Amino acid sequence: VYQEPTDPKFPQQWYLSGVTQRDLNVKAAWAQGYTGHGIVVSILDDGIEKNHPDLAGNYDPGASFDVNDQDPDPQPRYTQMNDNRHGTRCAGEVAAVANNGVCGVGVAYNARIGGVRMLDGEVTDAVEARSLGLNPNHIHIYSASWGPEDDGKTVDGPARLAEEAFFRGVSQGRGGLGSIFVWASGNGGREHDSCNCDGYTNSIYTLSISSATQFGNVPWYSEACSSTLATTYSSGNQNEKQIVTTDLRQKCTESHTGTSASAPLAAGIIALTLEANKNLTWRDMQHLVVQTSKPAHLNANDWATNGVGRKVSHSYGYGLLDAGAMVALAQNWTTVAPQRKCIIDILTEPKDIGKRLEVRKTVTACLGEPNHITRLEHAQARLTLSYNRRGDLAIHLVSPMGTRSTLLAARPHDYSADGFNDWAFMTTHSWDEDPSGEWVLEIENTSEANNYGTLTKFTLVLYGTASGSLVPR
């Protein structure tokens, strides 16, 4: 009979378990025997207090490095403001020790936990690359609660070394099964930011994770976009509870908040899932998340049913992670077929955008060829366009099965005249659909201004397989 943790703050970890059903169903995974034994997670952030009384028992120097100062020791830099507390907070969400009379517990409270000190300094492309590519045959899961500025006007993603680190990680990492990269979708909600304008979250190689408040609402900081895959609980208003974790100076906090807290909880759940099946590939893990995540009682005004019967939202992806369902489904999971990529260059000539542009194209999705896709995973609309005020654009992509993905909502602060230079807007919302047939791209001016520009390239990139589908939900 499984005994739940006795830690003093565990009763305050409302998001891990409860009679109420407003939780990530983590205790159900624990009771199946999965607590993270043997799995290694690294927090890429401002350091990790490796001697914290609730982290020391799980700390893994092999999962750690200090890229900012070029040494092995990721100990945070102590300051009066406690600026460098952030990574320690994230770490405790994943792997705080259980049943030791201290604070609460991590989701994967028997996993090994490290940290890469890489934000406390100038974060160059090389710094990111060295962090994402750290010990990729030892570290299983990387968690990143950082990214490009959420001012609602930035378009920015991995530069060359960091993109190379993503491809190397998913290709050769974890014994060729692929590094698991978990990303926080962002805090730009107040600025009306779009997490599709963030190349890290918009990458197919990252599981981009959004947030729900305790009462099931879209938090003030949440960014909506089509690249988000799923959700975990985090903070909300001041009547709603927050996240309990290890804090700097060997303390315990009950007020960890924001997008920063959602990715580590997902990384913990993924750690339990990897314990249940160590043979899972980086793509396997995304399939599990899609199939098992739960929309129920998450409030949003944009829930839509996609072509295979799954509910999907731009605020939440496929919904809240469900640890018990993840670990259960992982155990007899059949590895997915190798990933195919079908490149479709859509345009025969540039197109003036004006007030509204619609581009319709019927595709065969590489019919007759080895990269024929009948079972979509990610899809990208790689767009090259000029426009005089970028943030007045709204961009939608409709799949042959009728699923309307918002690739870009209006960004009122985005005054840029730089347009988009082969920006690979990504959607997860047509996962498992057949991508053969008519695709529709809509670009519109959401303002009354007389804006002007031209779409010069539209590449539809489809990823997926040609086998193994489930009967739609």
Partner: peptide
């Protein structure tokens, strides 16, 4: 940039 890169913000926490």
């Amino acid at each position: 940039x890169x913000v926490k």
